[PDB]
Amino acid sequence: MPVLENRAAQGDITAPGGARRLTGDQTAALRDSLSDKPAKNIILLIGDGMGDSEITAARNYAEGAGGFFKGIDALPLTGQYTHYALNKKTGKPDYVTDSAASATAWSTGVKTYNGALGVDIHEKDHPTILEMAKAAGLATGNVSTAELQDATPAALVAHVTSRKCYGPSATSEKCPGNALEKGGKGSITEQLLNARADVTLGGGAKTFAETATAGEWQGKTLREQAQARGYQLVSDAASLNSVTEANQQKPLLGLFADGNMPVRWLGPKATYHGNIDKPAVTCTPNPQRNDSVPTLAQMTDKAIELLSKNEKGFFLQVEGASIDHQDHAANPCGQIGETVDLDEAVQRALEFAKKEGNTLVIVTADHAHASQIVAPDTKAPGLTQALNTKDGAVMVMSYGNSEEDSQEHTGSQLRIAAYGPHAANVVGLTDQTDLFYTMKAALGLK
Amino acid sequence: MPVLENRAAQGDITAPGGARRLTGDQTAALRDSLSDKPAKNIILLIGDGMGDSEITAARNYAEGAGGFFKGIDALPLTGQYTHYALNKKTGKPDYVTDSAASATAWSTGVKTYNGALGVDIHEKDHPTILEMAKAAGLATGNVSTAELQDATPAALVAHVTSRKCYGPSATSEKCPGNALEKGGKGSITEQLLNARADVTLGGGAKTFAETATAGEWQGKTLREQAQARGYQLVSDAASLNSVTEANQQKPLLGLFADGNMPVRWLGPKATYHGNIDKPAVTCTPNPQRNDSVPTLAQMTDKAIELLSKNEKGFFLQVEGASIDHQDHAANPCGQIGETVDLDEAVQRALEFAKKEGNTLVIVTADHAHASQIVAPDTKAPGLTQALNTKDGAVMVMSYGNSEEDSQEHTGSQLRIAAYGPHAANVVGLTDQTDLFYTMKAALGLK
Ligand SMILES: [Zn+2]
Ligand SMILES: [Zn+2]
Ligand SMILES: [Zn+2]
Ligand SMILES: [Zn+2]
Ligand SMILES: [Zn+2]
Ligand SMILES: [Zn+2]
């Protein structure tokens, strides 16, 4: 099963045939990529808000228009999928989803309302792909650059009526029925601690400083509860590197930041008439990203090393979280850097898959976002910025869908790409809930 | 070779599994869709400005979020392709392309500057896929809802340094070197006349009222030159229907409007804070579309009947032109109606292909556009409108990338789907110039 080794423009883009990405007919290669044999493992990579527009701008900047992302662009079976949510009250489609409703969609197979995690419009809990893979005996991993209580990773292990029910204090007032003192399953963090995935890595240390208001570990911080429950706590790249085993008896929990892990590149925020008024921007590496802070490609490599020891197989969800945050912030360099960062993790995932032979790799996003690539001389109503690209040319990016402080998500259908046994199930048009079923069946969970 | 018969949400979208579009594993279906046998014919369908956002908005409105377009969404091999142009002066990538440079890309296989038609950055002509198909003996058709001098169809038969060189008067001043009086190949219209495709249908009658300034048919209108050269002039549905043969000896030319043919649906234009201030819009059929004016689906069906008489095979380009115009106009209803209109033609195309068996069908767009699907309560800086969808819910559309009168194109990569011999070549990441080589080889033109 081939991986697209190189789809970069093959020559001089100004000459006939120079911009071509193919060098020959693909039928045979595509035939060699179809396989319905079972999947022993599944690695799902999610770019938060990484729609086709985000992928194209990132590619233009970092690799040039005719460039190729060795990770993101290498998956050979591609398609487009819909990710609309539901109105809680009416049950009708809500065309633009938040991150919680979409995450719940691919993780349980049921559409839901914006802000909901692991429940339906009736607020009924539904098993997640993670809980099921675990029940079946497979190893499970949940890695992300966001705080672990954010929607994308929270959706694999918590079922709360509202995404804001981070820890005890927010839950008591936002999710009274999920609150431990009120007899419910608990806040997002407490639920994460009960779900016990073998590997969980990300930020969000802050909430672990809260104290249970009821239950066995009442009055102890959730950090104390974790240690007390047998979790291997780790907080830097070195200690993370030390880890040699991770399992149900010795579950690993890496908290690498109080909130979201640091962003990879720095740049100014887009502004009104920024491409006209201000000069072009060249992104700069964030000197605070640190070598004591593991990178997403590092977190992924470790998770795969550890989870692969399980003879039974594994399920791993990896997330490039800050792409969505930076898009909301109208900051091109931060947005693009997190896309580059995500590509590195995709490469470490394909390398394993390629060798292993029974791994389904999937790369996609939860919903589309605000940014659009527009002409250099555009005079737009919103925020824009000109960037000096790898090609030595100027690219102008525009965020114009909100007057509020945050740019908004958008409803367009977007790319889904896969590699391995059962990747055929992402080709053509599909729905995000379909991804739950594809994964459920590829793994043969019943 | 299967066509996706139904990818609509399978049931109650509020229940588990109800929003699924798949009913089973697709590996076997995808295997039956791969063929490298030669293509006898090729039907290329272009949605001008039809990016994934345009397709999604149109589906939500006309079919509902869980709907399915029987034409547009039924192609089983899909992918994404890049369509960046080149800076004439520098040779560097220009991230946002106009319709001239993109059209030249798939029709000649060479990247070029915005505004160019059938020439490279050096202003050198290059043969078009149509000129080649013709030289090879295949029948050729060029259909569109735009004026025939517009970029998308102009590109198959003209080579001018600027797309504005419609007829004699414009050429003399905009393209002195292409000017007939100055010894060049002639204006877009004159060149169309010389190209002599078997079937050419669309609008743009206005320019044929000009008179050559030189050459054999000097001082005659281009209309007179057409009749004099043996073209079958037709201008309404009925006369179009009467046509029983179309060939090199009796080439057919249908001019159904002075400019662009009429748009299918009417609605007001988006406005500032339109979704907040104004009530929701329900699109209304244009009572001037007329039954004497053949629809795109009809123009397509006729073109297929006539061109299929050629034992050798044929090449046909079909274009839903007004999607792009309505998007520039910030008119949701117009933009959506031409996408539905395009779907009708795609169905006519798949039906023929499905029975015939040696036909490569490709549906894609030249570039992405401005429109985005945003939350109902969005407070945006540009133009917005709320529409009442088929789901009985409200969808808000937003155009926010220009302060000028026209909304601008965008650079995002977009969908490309195919069906038939050689469709594998559109899967994964490709470039618009690759579509020229795919068609060239599928037809075996050398
Ligand atoms: Zn999100
Ligand atoms: Zn997220
Ligand atoms: Zn977001
Ligand atoms: Zn166009
Ligand atoms: Zn056009
Ligand atoms: Zn346009």
XYZ file of C-alpha atoms in Angstrom, chain A residues 101-426:
326
model
C -20.652 18.761 18.612
C -18.381 17.643 15.813
C -16.034 15.756 18.090
C -19.053 13.929 19.558
C -20.080 13.048 16.033
C -17.031 11.112 14.966
C -16.537 9.775 18.460
C -20.005 8.280 19.115
C -21.742 8.319 15.686
C -24.592 10.570 16.747
C -25.216 14.129 15.799
C -25.737 16.543 18.673
C -26.123 20.244 19.719
C -23.269 22.740 19.829
C -21.548 22.610 23.250
C -22.517 19.033 24.000
C -19.922 16.301 24.689
C -20.689 12.624 24.483
C -24.494 13.102 24.818
C -27.365 13.518 22.206
C -30.051 16.176 21.956
C -31.937 14.332 24.654
C -28.811 14.521 26.845
C -28.389 10.794 26.773
C -24.838 9.405 27.095
C -23.390 7.340 24.242
C -20.213 5.223 24.302
C -17.233 6.827 22.551
C -14.883 5.046 20.101
C -12.303 5.218 22.869
C -14.410 3.639 25.600
C -15.299 0.868 23.162
C -11.760 0.186 21.906
C -10.788 -0.041 25.612
C -13.643 -2.435 26.420
C -12.355 -4.614 23.618
C -8.909 -4.832 25.077
C -7.096 -2.468 22.756
C -4.712 0.224 24.018
C -5.992 3.805 23.750
C -4.272 7.147 23.489
C -5.522 10.720 23.441
C -2.937 13.349 22.533
C -3.473 17.066 21.934
C -1.702 20.446 22.052
C -4.800 22.013 23.712
C -5.744 21.814 27.364
C -7.124 18.298 27.868
C -10.464 19.650 28.992
C -11.058 21.262 25.601
C -13.729 19.647 23.371
C -11.594 17.608 20.929
C -9.939 15.344 23.455
C -12.683 15.767 26.110
C -15.159 14.108 23.731
C -13.387 10.753 23.870
C -13.785 10.381 27.652
C -16.481 12.742 29.054
C -20.249 13.053 28.690
C -21.453 16.408 29.939
C -24.271 18.599 28.802
C -21.871 21.549 28.296
C -18.286 21.820 27.117
C -17.515 24.376 29.811
C -17.789 21.862 32.670
C -14.041 21.621 33.016
C -13.640 20.713 36.624
C -15.687 20.681 39.813
C -16.474 24.384 40.136
C -17.683 24.949 36.623
C -19.637 21.701 36.565
C -21.596 22.492 39.727
C -22.995 25.589 38.089
C -22.970 24.710 34.429
C -23.778 21.034 34.577
C -25.662 20.506 37.865
C -26.831 17.089 36.686
C -23.315 15.889 35.949
C -21.901 17.292 39.190
C -20.475 14.793 41.627
C -22.149 16.368 44.696
C -25.449 16.084 42.890
C -24.936 12.402 42.115
C -23.740 12.655 38.480
C -20.714 11.152 36.631
C -18.593 14.198 37.241
C -16.856 17.065 35.470
C -14.834 16.643 32.253
C -11.554 16.156 34.208
C -13.006 13.747 36.698
C -14.451 11.764 33.851
C -11.120 11.762 32.063
C -9.549 10.359 35.190
C -12.174 7.556 35.291
C -11.933 6.701 31.631
C -8.306 5.762 32.216
C -6.859 5.796 28.695
C -3.345 4.292 28.663
C -1.740 7.438 27.191
C -3.131 10.992 27.573
C -0.765 13.936 26.704
C -1.462 17.650 26.427
C -1.896 20.872 28.380
C -4.504 21.877 30.934
C -2.669 21.408 34.235
C -4.596 24.267 35.767
C -7.895 22.397 36.292
C -6.145 19.475 37.978
C -5.549 21.857 40.879
C -9.234 21.677 41.840
C -10.557 19.466 44.586
C -13.359 16.896 44.363
C -16.430 18.062 46.235
C -17.659 14.505 46.865
C -16.659 10.905 46.289
C -13.702 8.832 47.396
C -11.043 11.486 46.718
C -13.156 14.271 48.124
C -11.170 17.312 49.189
C -8.060 16.251 47.303
C -6.930 17.997 44.174
C -7.525 16.064 40.949
C -3.747 15.864 40.672
C -3.572 14.037 44.005
C -6.409 11.833 42.824
C -4.416 10.942 39.688
C -1.280 9.950 41.562
C -3.421 8.131 44.108
C -5.105 6.188 41.278
C -1.839 5.023 39.829
C -1.302 7.412 36.917
C 2.308 8.132 35.859
C 2.385 11.923 35.973
C 4.894 13.542 33.556
C 5.367 17.262 32.685
C 8.315 17.779 30.436
C 9.889 16.242 27.421
C 12.642 14.607 29.403
C 10.466 12.809 31.902
C 8.163 11.983 29.005
C 11.105 10.407 27.170
C 11.916 8.321 30.246
C 8.588 6.505 30.136
C 9.006 2.870 29.089
C 5.635 1.345 29.674
C 2.106 2.609 29.817
C -0.939 0.479 30.593
C -4.084 0.040 32.601
C -2.053 -0.597 35.695
C 0.387 2.202 34.933
C -1.579 4.795 32.901
C 0.401 7.787 31.683
C -0.753 11.380 32.066
C 1.364 14.211 30.607
C 0.380 17.774 31.529
C 2.778 19.989 29.588
C 1.297 23.467 30.238
C -1.242 25.138 32.463
C -3.422 25.866 29.467
C -2.789 25.209 25.784
C 0.782 24.240 24.876
C 2.836 27.063 23.293
C 2.316 27.939 19.609
C 5.179 27.272 17.181
C 5.491 30.589 15.281
C 4.907 34.207 16.136
C 3.619 36.982 13.970
C 1.402 40.062 14.341
C -2.367 39.839 14.170
C -4.188 40.687 10.900
C -5.675 44.216 10.853
C -8.002 46.418 8.804
C -6.286 47.170 5.449
C -3.204 45.366 6.761
C -2.038 44.284 3.354
C -2.236 47.819 2.027
C -0.993 49.755 4.952
C 1.543 47.484 6.576
C 4.625 45.719 4.963
C 4.776 41.958 4.395
C 5.226 39.611 7.342
C 7.706 36.778 7.652
C 6.800 34.395 10.467
C 9.287 33.898 13.261
C 9.828 30.826 15.535
C 8.390 31.270 19.039
C 11.375 31.407 21.298
C 9.133 30.114 24.112
C 8.156 26.882 22.370
C 11.104 25.251 24.264
C 13.109 21.986 24.059
C 11.719 21.036 27.468
C 8.264 21.091 25.819
C 7.637 18.063 23.630
C 6.416 18.839 20.105
C 3.308 17.281 18.650
C 5.487 14.981 16.520
C 7.339 13.992 19.706
C 4.125 13.369 21.724
C 2.831 11.214 18.811
C 6.013 9.173 18.455
C 6.077 8.366 22.140
C 2.349 7.509 22.172
C 2.879 5.102 19.272
C 5.920 3.495 20.922
C 4.028 2.850 24.091
C 0.679 1.802 22.608
C 2.280 -0.570 20.125
C 3.510 -2.908 22.862
C -0.128 -4.060 23.165
C -0.374 -7.186 21.019
C -4.103 -6.565 20.649
C -3.824 -3.233 18.838
C -4.611 0.387 19.545
C -6.612 3.503 18.976
C -4.890 6.893 19.062
C -6.388 10.325 18.463
C -3.828 13.116 17.859
C -4.806 16.747 17.657
C -3.281 19.894 16.237
C -5.372 22.127 18.392
C -4.036 25.652 18.052
C -4.761 25.945 14.309
C -8.360 26.778 15.366
C -7.330 29.157 18.126
C -4.992 31.091 15.888
C -7.673 31.330 13.122
C -10.102 32.764 15.670
C -7.373 35.211 16.543
C -6.786 36.314 12.988
C -3.086 35.497 13.340
C -1.734 33.962 10.156
C 1.736 32.929 11.459
C 0.302 31.162 14.494
C -2.377 29.458 12.288
C 0.117 28.292 9.686
C 2.735 27.152 12.187
C 0.225 24.828 13.896
C -0.538 23.390 10.472
C 3.149 22.756 9.839
C 3.380 21.324 13.279
C 0.467 19.019 12.534
C 2.125 17.791 9.296
C 5.175 16.578 11.294
C 2.888 14.392 13.436
C 1.179 13.106 10.300
C 4.570 12.038 8.993
C 5.499 10.190 12.134
C 2.062 8.476 11.794
C 2.529 7.381 8.211
C 6.036 6.037 8.782
C 4.760 3.640 11.436
C 1.740 2.730 9.368
C 3.799 2.151 6.302
C 5.998 -0.385 8.142
C 3.343 -1.952 10.349
C 0.903 -2.672 7.513
C -2.348 -2.878 9.451
C -2.853 0.669 10.458
C -5.629 3.025 9.315
C -4.419 6.623 9.319
C -6.954 9.366 8.946
C -6.365 13.083 8.663
C -9.131 15.596 8.837
C -10.692 18.545 10.597
C -13.803 18.926 12.798
C -15.185 21.944 10.810
C -14.050 24.693 8.410
C -12.836 28.161 9.485
C -12.675 31.861 8.698
C -9.518 32.394 6.621
C -9.462 32.973 2.930
C -6.550 33.583 0.530
C -7.379 36.747 -1.497
C -5.612 38.942 -4.074
C -2.713 41.125 -3.026
C -4.506 44.393 -3.700
C -7.752 43.381 -2.024
C -9.471 46.185 -0.078
C -11.521 44.187 2.414
C -13.933 45.023 5.198
C -12.234 42.795 7.715
C -8.774 41.861 8.849
C -5.983 41.090 6.395
C -2.196 40.566 6.313
C 0.369 40.096 3.506
C 2.926 37.311 4.094
C 6.208 36.686 2.309
C 5.965 33.083 1.134
C 8.482 30.359 0.494
C 8.203 31.178 -3.196
C 9.475 34.645 -2.593
C 6.110 36.190 -3.318
C 3.318 37.840 -1.378
C 0.149 36.016 -0.260
C -2.655 37.955 1.387
C -4.832 36.351 3.992
C -8.272 37.598 5.014
C -10.547 37.054 8.015
C -13.873 38.783 7.437
C -16.731 36.888 9.030
C -17.109 38.622 12.402
C -17.037 42.102 13.941
C -16.573 40.479 17.344
C -13.178 39.705 18.765
C -13.158 36.128 17.447
C -13.366 35.085 13.790
C -15.992 32.371 13.284
C -16.182 28.728 12.115
C -17.711 28.107 8.738
C -20.017 25.506 7.376
C -18.349 24.313 4.271
C -17.713 20.572 3.700
C -13.924 19.742 3.835
C -11.208 17.228 3.099
C -10.822 13.815 4.684
C -7.838 11.712 3.707
C -6.859 8.187 4.804
C -4.270 5.413 4.307
C -4.499 1.706 5.110
C -7.155 -1.054 5.534
C -10.645 0.483 5.064
C -9.565 3.920 3.860
C -11.944 3.522 0.910
C -14.683 4.614 3.353
C -13.563 8.254 3.244
